[PDB]
């Protein structure tokens, strides 16, 4: 068209631009879009349960997504399936990483989010691994893994297995420790750097901060008790 | 789909095999010492590197479990991986070497009287 | 012996060339799939009664229809070349699934410590 | 072979922890004769290969237990 | 047999808006082996928002991906 | 060589005159003998990307 | 099994011949598609520039833009900050350090008031939560100290900064406080 912007043809409008009323945002529903999909997805989890009953543990469905619990010694036969089945044509991984809860004797749950392409459907798959014992990687199945599992190893020390180039990416190259363990805090052990006397040797020390991270240690009565919902 | 200096991750079962594997790791980690002194231009000598490498492995002579010795082997071979080329820099590299005394001045003689 | 898993250097839609004879290669792959999985692991398992029944369903729709386009709109997958690519690996999946025998009992019981988050 | 082990019994003598060079019989053990550590065994192996400027494979480092074996591999060039 | 050398691609300003330390190996000025090397910028947000509250979390959270800010705000908020 | 054929050509283009109807013929023969060398070298000189494979995949 | 994901329709698209009839050799041979881009940048050359002579002119300063933490006071102001600590508990780099005491006249005031301008992200949560609207992001970019010791704002700097301008802050609030 014409009559758009400067070098003006003297034609403009900033008037009569309204829709004056009182709002009518009639809604109450928190999560009801998902309930038919949750009822479908229970049945999908029951299919995955009955199909591979040796290698799987209990499924866990929550709010339009799905998480399969897997015994950690046997993940590779599970993920030869379920990436690559006809009925489960996922073929696209989106996250492998880890979560510590240092409550239990096994310490680091390892969490995988996968993505379908034909089906527009995510999934989650968990193992549990200890700092002591490794669990095998999934780089044998596809090539998108070998970067992420480096990230998992660096943030946790969740040691892996059957994998090429298990380096560090996410820390300093002489830095031991593992940050996303809840063992050592935010400051780190040795984090200083200075270079005056032994010239340019930016060598660490004991990291003595200038004001410590004064925490948040307040907590109210109790959050909520969940209004459960399942298909069955 | 690649490596850099053939880092492999496959922990064996038997403690004898892990012994031999750490032994060959020690040989490469010791052989690379003039390559280290070339690469980083340290002040000290190659035998200082060798006695400190020997010190580092004698730090974990008496570790029992092979399932701890696995990830100790991974740490050793992996820091060999990050030392055999120029990933580490000399400021990063001197974190193994408490070399000089004169930085400290007079200090604790490990007596109780001079804690005060 | 079906070498028409994926073709080379022709221009189909998404970076995977057009196979020449998709119907005979696909019906041979379904025949080999039914020959492998049915004669390896028992009909008791739900996995066999799922993969087998879907395989016979796909076999029916392929053996019925003629063109490479109506078979798409009934098969529920993407392109027919990509249907063949998909239809390849469940043969090798069931072929691997001969090993690591999944229709047995669950080999490990976790302590139930592992599957506790909150509440 | 001749006076290769002269160089070897010079290098190992120059190496520490062996207070008696008279205890160094040439054709003798490493860890039995002199109480060398299994770590220190391949340490002096790498010292030997660095003295002669030669590089050895892994199994050749595996088999060395006495220096007659070492001289026998030195003979390969 | 192959005898290939290596270079370091970017210390500071090879590609703008990236500390692109790329350890890149060449034989015939062909990238036979590629080893991206990132992580120079591990500012550790992934640790830091474990001790921050949710209202406090968001101005950490668009410091990741600093060219699409409030979209990253939106994905955290979703 | 493609420099010093221009060095060869440079006296001819200096005195293009005083050689009329005949220096044209000789230099046309010279350029024919050179251009066939060009049609030799057009067939080969390029780099080759070493790693790009495409062969079809087979099963048993 | 319908499973409705299909229909990319895969255009075969031979495209062997009849793109051009020697016009192709013309557009390839001399740089017509590229001379077009030269004509575009020449037509762009004639139009207006956009530089803003920054010592003498300034870019647009919205009223909600954030600045240097000036402490407001009341009309005849009794140092409007009450050390209520709400502006402490959300400063996401913990750049707030306060200490408070019952002052002589009975009310509570700030003994010291500390902003690490080293580590103030300018999230404005301090302004979004101080209930008496006493800490306020300024619009002024008046900065560039040579020491950190000239950045660590104590109470006197912030009260001075609010005393240097509340005119600008009054303009800011009187265009913003019915939205905050
Ligand atoms: S503006 Fe943000 S960073 Fe600054 S003191 Fe206020 S809350 Fe903290
Ligand atoms: S939020 Fe208000 S009352 Fe609280 S410390 Fe800041 S200025 Fe004082």
CSV table of N, CA and C in Angstrom, one decimal, chain B:
chain,number,residue,atom,x,y,z
B,1,UNK,N,31.1,-38.7,17.8
B,1,UNK,CA,31.6,-39.3,16.5
B,1,UNK,C,33.1,-39.0,16.4
B,2,UNK,N,33.6,-38.5,17.6
B,2,UNK,CA,35.1,-38.3,17.6
B,2,UNK,C,35.6,-38.5,19.0
B,3,UNK,N,36.9,-38.2,19.1
B,3,UNK,CA,37.7,-38.3,20.3
B,3,UNK,C,38.5,-37.1,20.4
B,4,UNK,N,39.5,-37.0,21.3
B,4,UNK,CA,40.6,-36.1,21.2
B,4,UNK,C,41.9,-36.8,21.5
B,5,UNK,N,41.9,-37.7,22.5
B,5,UNK,CA,43.1,-38.5,22.7
B,5,UNK,C,42.6,-39.9,23.2
B,6,UNK,N,41.5,-40.4,22.6
B,6,UNK,CA,41.0,-41.7,22.7
B,6,UNK,C,40.6,-42.0,24.2
B,7,UNK,N,39.8,-41.1,24.7
B,7,UNK,CA,39.2,-41.3,26.0
B,7,UNK,C,38.1,-42.4,25.9
B,8,UNK,N,38.3,-43.5,26.6
B,8,UNK,CA,37.4,-44.6,26.7
B,8,UNK,C,36.8,-44.7,28.1
B,9,UNK,N,35.5,-45.0,28.2
B,9,UNK,CA,34.8,-45.2,29.4
B,9,UNK,C,34.2,-46.6,29.4
B,10,UNK,N,34.9,-47.6,30.0
B,10,UNK,CA,34.3,-48.9,30.2
B,10,UNK,C,35.0,-49.5,31.4
B,11,UNK,N,34.4,-49.6,32.5
B,11,UNK,CA,35.0,-50.1,33.7
B,11,UNK,C,34.9,-51.6,33.7
B,12,UNK,N,36.0,-52.3,33.9
B,12,UNK,CA,36.2,-53.7,34.0
B,12,UNK,C,35.7,-54.2,35.3
B,13,UNK,N,35.7,-55.5,35.5
B,13,UNK,CA,35.2,-56.0,36.8
B,13,UNK,C,36.4,-56.3,37.7
B,14,UNK,N,37.4,-57.1,37.3
B,14,UNK,CA,38.4,-57.7,38.2
B,14,UNK,C,39.4,-56.6,38.6
B,15,UNK,N,39.8,-56.7,39.8
B,15,UNK,CA,40.7,-55.7,40.4
B,15,UNK,C,42.1,-55.8,39.8
B,16,UNK,N,42.5,-57.0,39.3
B,16,UNK,CA,43.8,-57.2,38.6
B,16,UNK,C,43.8,-56.4,37.3
B,17,UNK,N,42.7,-56.5,36.6
B,17,UNK,CA,42.6,-55.8,35.3
B,17,UNK,C,42.6,-54.3,35.5
B,18,UNK,N,41.9,-53.8,36.5
B,18,UNK,CA,42.0,-52.4,36.8
B,18,UNK,C,43.4,-52.0,37.3
B,19,UNK,N,44.1,-52.9,38.0
B,19,UNK,CA,45.5,-52.6,38.3
B,19,UNK,C,46.3,-52.4,37.1
B,20,UNK,N,46.2,-53.3,36.1
B,20,UNK,CA,47.0,-53.2,34.9
B,20,UNK,C,46.6,-52.0,34.1
B,21,UNK,N,45.3,-51.6,34.2
B,21,UNK,CA,44.9,-50.5,33.4
B,21,UNK,C,45.4,-49.2,34.0
B,22,UNK,N,45.3,-49.0,35.3
B,22,UNK,CA,45.9,-47.9,36.0
B,22,UNK,C,47.4,-47.8,35.8
B,23,UNK,N,48.0,-49.0,35.7
B,23,UNK,CA,49.5,-49.0,35.5
B,23,UNK,C,49.9,-48.5,34.1
B,24,UNK,N,49.2,-48.9,33.1
B,24,UNK,CA,49.4,-48.3,31.7
B,24,UNK,C,49.0,-46.8,31.7
B,25,UNK,N,48.0,-46.4,32.4
B,25,UNK,CA,47.7,-45.0,32.5
B,25,UNK,C,48.8,-44.3,33.2
B,26,UNK,N,49.4,-44.8,34.2
B,26,UNK,CA,50.5,-44.2,34.9
B,26,UNK,C,51.7,-44.1,34.0
B,27,UNK,N,51.9,-45.0,33.1
B,27,UNK,CA,53.0,-44.9,32.1
B,27,UNK,C,52.8,-43.8,31.1
B,28,UNK,N,51.6,-43.7,30.6
B,28,UNK,CA,51.4,-42.5,29.7
B,28,UNK,C,51.4,-41.2,30.4
B,29,UNK,N,50.9,-41.2,31.6
B,29,UNK,CA,50.8,-39.9,32.4
B,29,UNK,C,52.2,-39.5,32.9
B,30,UNK,N,53.1,-40.5,33.0
B,30,UNK,CA,54.5,-40.2,33.3
B,30,UNK,C,55.3,-39.9,32.0
B,31,UNK,N,55.0,-40.5,30.9
B,31,UNK,CA,55.7,-40.3,29.7
B,31,UNK,C,55.5,-38.9,29.1
B,32,UNK,N,54.3,-38.4,29.4
B,32,UNK,CA,53.9,-37.0,28.9
B,32,UNK,C,54.5,-35.9,29.7
B,33,UNK,N,55.4,-36.2,30.6
B,33,UNK,CA,56.0,-35.1,31.5
B,33,UNK,C,56.9,-34.1,30.7
B,34,UNK,N,57.8,-34.5,29.8
B,34,UNK,CA,58.5,-33.5,29.1
B,34,UNK,C,57.6,-32.8,28.1
B,35,UNK,N,56.6,-33.4,27.6
B,35,UNK,CA,55.6,-32.7,26.8
B,35,UNK,C,54.8,-31.7,27.7
B,36,UNK,N,54.6,-32.0,28.9
B,36,UNK,CA,54.0,-31.0,29.8
B,36,UNK,C,54.9,-29.8,30.1
B,37,UNK,N,56.2,-30.1,30.4
B,37,UNK,CA,57.1,-29.0,30.6
B,37,UNK,C,57.4,-28.1,29.4
B,38,UNK,N,57.4,-28.8,28.2
B,38,UNK,CA,57.4,-28.0,27.0
B,38,UNK,C,56.1,-27.2,26.9
B,39,UNK,N,55.0,-27.8,27.2
B,39,UNK,CA,53.7,-27.1,26.8
B,39,UNK,C,53.4,-26.0,27.7
B,40,UNK,N,53.8,-26.0,29.0
B,40,UNK,CA,53.3,-25.0,29.9
B,40,UNK,C,54.4,-24.1,30.4
B,41,UNK,N,55.7,-24.5,30.2
B,41,UNK,CA,56.9,-23.7,30.5
B,41,UNK,C,56.9,-23.4,32.0
B,42,UNK,N,57.0,-24.5,32.8
B,42,UNK,CA,57.1,-24.4,34.3
B,42,UNK,C,58.5,-24.0,34.6
B,43,UNK,N,58.7,-23.6,35.9
B,43,UNK,CA,60.0,-23.3,36.4
B,43,UNK,C,60.8,-24.5,36.8
B,44,UNK,N,60.1,-25.4,37.5
B,44,UNK,CA,60.7,-26.6,38.1
B,44,UNK,C,61.0,-27.6,37.0
B,45,UNK,N,61.7,-28.7,37.4
B,45,UNK,CA,62.2,-29.7,36.5
B,45,UNK,C,61.2,-30.8,36.2
B,46,UNK,N,61.6,-31.6,35.2
B,46,UNK,CA,60.8,-32.8,34.9
B,46,UNK,C,60.8,-33.8,36.0
B,47,UNK,N,61.9,-34.1,36.8
B,47,UNK,CA,61.8,-34.9,38.0
B,47,UNK,C,60.8,-34.4,39.1
B,48,UNK,N,60.6,-33.1,39.1
B,48,UNK,CA,59.6,-32.6,40.1
B,48,UNK,C,58.2,-33.0,39.7
B,49,UNK,N,57.9,-33.0,38.3
B,49,UNK,CA,56.7,-33.5,37.8
B,49,UNK,C,56.5,-35.0,38.1
B,50,UNK,N,57.6,-35.7,38.0
B,50,UNK,CA,57.5,-37.2,38.2
B,50,UNK,C,57.3,-37.5,39.6
B,51,UNK,N,58.0,-36.9,40.6
B,51,UNK,CA,57.8,-37.2,42.0
B,51,UNK,C,56.4,-36.7,42.4
B,52,UNK,N,55.9,-35.6,41.8
B,52,UNK,CA,54.5,-35.3,42.2
B,52,UNK,C,53.5,-36.2,41.7
B,53,UNK,N,53.7,-36.7,40.4
B,53,UNK,CA,52.7,-37.7,39.9
B,53,UNK,C,52.8,-38.9,40.7
B,54,UNK,N,53.9,-39.4,41.2
B,54,UNK,CA,54.1,-40.5,42.1
B,54,UNK,C,53.4,-40.2,43.4
B,55,UNK,N,53.5,-39.0,43.9
B,55,UNK,CA,52.8,-38.5,45.1
B,55,UNK,C,51.3,-38.7,44.9
B,56,UNK,N,50.8,-38.2,43.8
B,56,UNK,CA,49.4,-38.3,43.5
B,56,UNK,C,48.8,-39.7,43.5
B,57,UNK,N,49.6,-40.6,42.9
B,57,UNK,CA,49.1,-42.0,42.9
B,57,UNK,C,49.3,-42.6,44.3
B,58,UNK,N,50.3,-42.3,45.0
B,58,UNK,CA,50.4,-42.8,46.4
B,58,UNK,C,49.4,-42.2,47.3
B,59,UNK,N,48.7,-41.1,46.9
B,59,UNK,CA,47.6,-40.7,47.7
B,59,UNK,C,46.4,-41.6,47.7
B,60,UNK,N,46.3,-42.6,46.7
B,60,UNK,CA,45.2,-43.5,46.7
B,60,UNK,C,45.7,-44.9,46.5
B,61,UNK,N,46.9,-45.2,47.1
B,61,UNK,CA,47.3,-46.6,47.1
B,61,UNK,C,46.4,-47.5,47.9
B,62,UNK,N,45.9,-47.1,49.0
B,62,UNK,CA,45.2,-48.0,49.9
B,62,UNK,C,43.7,-47.8,49.9
B,63,UNK,N,43.1,-47.5,48.7
B,63,UNK,CA,41.7,-47.4,48.5
B,63,UNK,C,41.2,-48.8,48.2
B,64,UNK,N,40.2,-49.3,48.9
B,64,UNK,CA,39.8,-50.7,48.8
B,64,UNK,C,38.9,-51.0,47.6
B,65,UNK,N,37.8,-50.3,47.5
B,65,UNK,CA,36.8,-50.8,46.5
B,65,UNK,C,37.2,-50.5,45.1
B,66,UNK,N,37.1,-51.5,44.2
B,66,UNK,CA,37.3,-51.3,42.8
B,66,UNK,C,36.2,-50.5,42.2
B,67,UNK,N,35.0,-50.4,42.9
B,67,UNK,CA,33.9,-49.6,42.4
B,67,UNK,C,34.1,-48.2,43.0
B,68,UNK,N,35.2,-47.8,43.7
B,68,UNK,CA,35.6,-46.5,43.8
B,68,UNK,C,36.8,-46.2,42.9
B,69,UNK,N,37.7,-47.2,42.7
B,69,UNK,CA,38.8,-47.1,41.9
B,69,UNK,C,38.4,-46.9,40.4
B,70,UNK,N,37.2,-47.3,40.0
B,70,UNK,CA,36.7,-47.0,38.7
B,70,UNK,C,36.7,-45.5,38.4
B,71,UNK,N,36.0,-44.8,39.3
B,71,UNK,CA,35.9,-43.4,39.0
B,71,UNK,C,37.2,-42.6,39.3
B,72,UNK,N,38.0,-43.2,40.2
B,72,UNK,CA,39.3,-42.7,40.3
B,72,UNK,C,40.1,-42.9,39.0
B,73,UNK,N,40.0,-44.0,38.4
B,73,UNK,CA,40.6,-44.2,37.1
B,73,UNK,C,40.1,-43.3,36.0
B,74,UNK,N,38.8,-43.0,36.1
B,74,UNK,CA,38.2,-42.1,35.1
B,74,UNK,C,38.7,-40.7,35.3
B,75,UNK,N,38.8,-40.2,36.6
B,75,UNK,CA,39.4,-38.9,36.9
B,75,UNK,C,40.8,-38.8,36.5
B,76,UNK,N,41.6,-39.9,36.7
B,76,UNK,CA,43.0,-39.9,36.3
B,76,UNK,C,43.2,-39.8,34.7
B,77,UNK,N,42.5,-40.7,34.0
B,77,UNK,CA,42.6,-40.7,32.6
B,77,UNK,C,42.0,-39.5,32.0
B,78,UNK,N,41.0,-38.9,32.6
B,78,UNK,CA,40.3,-37.7,32.1
B,78,UNK,C,41.2,-36.5,32.3
B,79,UNK,N,41.9,-36.4,33.4
B,79,UNK,CA,42.8,-35.2,33.6
B,79,UNK,C,44.0,-35.4,32.8
B,80,UNK,N,44.4,-36.7,32.5
B,80,UNK,CA,45.4,-36.9,31.4
B,80,UNK,C,44.9,-36.4,30.1
B,81,UNK,N,43.6,-36.6,29.8
B,81,UNK,CA,43.0,-36.2,28.6
B,81,UNK,C,43.1,-34.6,28.5
B,82,UNK,N,42.7,-34.0,29.6
B,82,UNK,CA,42.8,-32.5,29.6
B,82,UNK,C,44.2,-31.9,29.8
B,83,UNK,N,45.2,-32.8,30.1
B,83,UNK,CA,46.6,-32.3,30.1
B,83,UNK,C,47.4,-32.6,28.8
B,84,UNK,N,47.0,-33.6,28.1
B,84,UNK,CA,47.8,-34.0,26.9
B,84,UNK,C,47.7,-33.0,25.8
B,85,UNK,N,46.7,-32.1,25.8
B,85,UNK,CA,46.7,-31.0,24.9
B,85,UNK,C,46.6,-29.7,25.7
B,86,UNK,N,46.3,-28.6,25.0
B,86,UNK,CA,46.3,-27.3,25.7
B,86,UNK,C,44.9,-26.9,26.1
B,87,UNK,N,44.1,-27.8,26.6
B,87,UNK,CA,42.9,-27.3,27.2
B,87,UNK,C,43.2,-26.6,28.5
B,88,UNK,N,44.0,-27.2,29.4
B,88,UNK,CA,44.4,-26.5,30.6
B,88,UNK,C,45.4,-25.5,30.2
B,89,UNK,N,45.4,-24.4,31.0
B,89,UNK,CA,46.3,-23.3,30.8
B,89,UNK,C,47.2,-23.3,32.1
B,90,UNK,N,48.3,-22.6,32.0
B,90,UNK,CA,49.3,-22.7,33.1
B,90,UNK,C,48.8,-22.1,34.4
B,91,UNK,N,47.9,-21.2,34.4
B,91,UNK,CA,47.2,-20.7,35.6
B,91,UNK,C,46.3,-21.8,36.1
B,92,UNK,N,45.6,-22.5,35.2
B,92,UNK,CA,44.8,-23.6,35.6
B,92,UNK,C,45.7,-24.8,36.0
B,93,UNK,N,46.9,-24.8,35.5
B,93,UNK,CA,47.8,-26.0,35.7
B,93,UNK,C,48.6,-25.9,37.0
B,94,UNK,N,48.9,-24.7,37.5
B,94,UNK,CA,49.6,-24.7,38.8
B,94,UNK,C,48.8,-25.0,40.0
B,95,UNK,N,47.5,-25.4,39.8
B,95,UNK,CA,46.7,-25.8,41.0
B,95,UNK,C,47.1,-27.2,41.5
B,96,UNK,N,48.1,-27.9,40.9
B,96,UNK,CA,48.7,-29.1,41.5
B,96,UNK,C,50.0,-28.8,42.2
B,97,UNK,N,50.5,-27.6,42.2
B,97,UNK,CA,51.9,-27.5,42.5
B,97,UNK,C,52.1,-26.4,43.6
B,98,UNK,N,52.0,-26.8,44.9
B,98,UNK,CA,52.4,-25.9,45.9
B,98,UNK,C,54.0,-25.8,46.0
B,99,UNK,N,54.5,-25.0,45.1
B,99,UNK,CA,55.9,-25.0,44.8
B,99,UNK,C,56.7,-24.2,45.8
B,100,UNK,N,56.4,-22.9,46.0
B,100,UNK,CA,57.2,-22.0,46.7
B,100,UNK,C,56.8,-21.8,48.1
B,101,UNK,N,57.7,-21.6,49.0
B,101,UNK,CA,57.5,-21.4,50.4
B,101,UNK,C,57.5,-19.9,50.8
B,102,UNK,N,58.3,-19.1,50.1
B,102,UNK,CA,58.4,-17.7,50.4
B,102,UNK,C,57.2,-16.8,50.2
B,103,UNK,N,56.1,-17.4,49.6
B,103,UNK,CA,54.8,-16.7,49.6
B,103,UNK,C,54.2,-16.6,51.0
B,104,UNK,N,54.5,-17.5,51.9
B,104,UNK,CA,53.8,-17.6,53.1
B,104,UNK,C,54.4,-16.8,54.3
B,105,UNK,N,55.7,-16.4,54.2
B,105,UNK,CA,56.4,-15.8,55.3
B,105,UNK,C,56.6,-16.8,56.4
B,106,UNK,N,56.8,-16.3,57.6
B,106,UNK,CA,56.7,-17.2,58.8
B,106,UNK,C,55.3,-17.6,59.1
B,107,UNK,N,55.0,-18.8,59.4
B,107,UNK,CA,53.7,-19.3,59.5
B,107,UNK,C,53.7,-20.4,60.6
B,108,UNK,N,52.6,-21.2,60.6
B,108,UNK,CA,52.3,-22.2,61.6
B,108,UNK,C,53.4,-23.3,61.6
B,109,UNK,N,54.1,-23.5,62.7
B,109,UNK,CA,55.1,-24.6,62.8
B,109,UNK,C,54.4,-25.9,63.3
B,110,UNK,N,53.1,-25.9,63.3
B,110,UNK,CA,52.2,-27.1,63.7
B,110,UNK,C,52.4,-27.3,65.2
B,111,UNK,N,52.6,-26.3,66.0
B,111,UNK,CA,52.6,-26.4,67.4
B,111,UNK,C,51.3,-25.8,67.9
B,112,UNK,N,50.9,-26.1,69.1
B,112,UNK,CA,49.7,-25.5,69.7
B,112,UNK,C,50.0,-24.1,70.1
B,113,UNK,N,51.2,-23.8,70.6
B,113,UNK,CA,51.6,-22.5,71.1
B,113,UNK,C,51.5,-21.5,70.1
B,114,UNK,N,51.7,-21.8,68.8
B,114,UNK,CA,51.7,-20.8,67.8
B,114,UNK,C,50.4,-20.9,66.9
B,115,UNK,N,49.4,-21.7,67.3
B,115,UNK,CA,48.1,-21.3,66.9
B,115,UNK,C,47.7,-20.0,67.6
B,116,UNK,N,48.1,-19.7,68.8
B,116,UNK,CA,48.0,-18.4,69.3
B,116,UNK,C,49.1,-17.6,68.9
